[PDB]
Amino acid sequence: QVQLQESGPSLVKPSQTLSLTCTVSGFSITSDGVLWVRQAPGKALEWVGAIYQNGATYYNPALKSRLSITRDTSKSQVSLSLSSVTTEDTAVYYCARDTDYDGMDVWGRGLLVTVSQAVLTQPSSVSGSLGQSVSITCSGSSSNVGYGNYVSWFQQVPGSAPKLLIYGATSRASGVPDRFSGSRSGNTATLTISSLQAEDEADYYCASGDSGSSLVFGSGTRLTVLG
């Protein structure tokens, strides 16, 4: 069974290095990529960096001056170091797998760590009755959502690892009910839920590759369902 688990200090002093480890089981670090994502309290998901099958690394430009990601293939381990931390780096840090054909499908449950340019627009809130169709659009640019078929959607019940819904703009992730659909009209991508159910009440995030070989998340959408 495919498992990822983040570990390390839950407390870090300002100006110290935040060091986390990802332990992987049920797959080889040399077959699938490993991603780091983080989420500050009451904030959107933010891509941190990635390490691929050849150990090739990619960082978030805003964190690059302070990031090191490394791998130990023999122990199935990926390491994050973030230096010069302030309280702005307090967040839940997520581990996730990035596959050839299945997208960013498996996530660790996240570790809360306390320290003591282009963007994707989403409406803050959407709502709907049981059985109703609902649509959520994320807007980007020619560089990200328009740049080709590289768009993901995620569902997050807050206090939980996000869950892949849609990858490559239109493909439904394995085990995802087929009331979820993705479409894409040039610079805009749209997730449709044809028949809203009670456990669809969650936050939804658009994510897109940029030209700059980075990944960008949207601002997030709170979906309410009206009993």
Add this chain to the structure above:
Amino acid sequence: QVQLQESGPSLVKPSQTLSLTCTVSGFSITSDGVLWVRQAPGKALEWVGAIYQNGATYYNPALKSRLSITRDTSKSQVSLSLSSVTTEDTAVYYCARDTDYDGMDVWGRGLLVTVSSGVLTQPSSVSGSLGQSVSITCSGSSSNVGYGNYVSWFQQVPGSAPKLLIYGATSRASGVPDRFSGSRSGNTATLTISSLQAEDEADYYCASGDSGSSLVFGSGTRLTVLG
């Protein structure tokens, strides 16, 4: 590090047996007990059962007819079988440690299991302003709260495993700030939070040892911090 993890299938058809394994590391199942707790979506915590160091087993009288708990000390595993399942058994299933002197201090992250095919009294809600005191009482009887200093208090941020605050009515769990204190007077236990911070917003559960060698949880209390 002390770590517990619940594994097993997340979907189970009515009338079949729900089988879960808890895998333990950083301590021996011959030194510390392991208990199972479950939570129905938007419901209180419910004691399932416990297996101690000698392998002595205890069950929730309400679930006893359908429950088996076993252990394998060599693989460091504790098994849970619950037979004759209905939708009423749909819940997050939590594995937790029970220690001689630290109380029920470490918890697994919990596993949701959906069964599908298609008395301890707490005030329900309480509020305080930043910087101010807040008191939560749980009412019981002479067999549970009234009996010994066997009273615990938990914090649960929804989406998250309960966290131990107080054990033995009065003693603070390791790493718990001292703005949390416990008192006990007759059939009544009180948790006091003395300097409310915004992260103290959460659900709070009283739990008590019980004269029928059982463990019972209270109805829970939603705390709000006024800005």
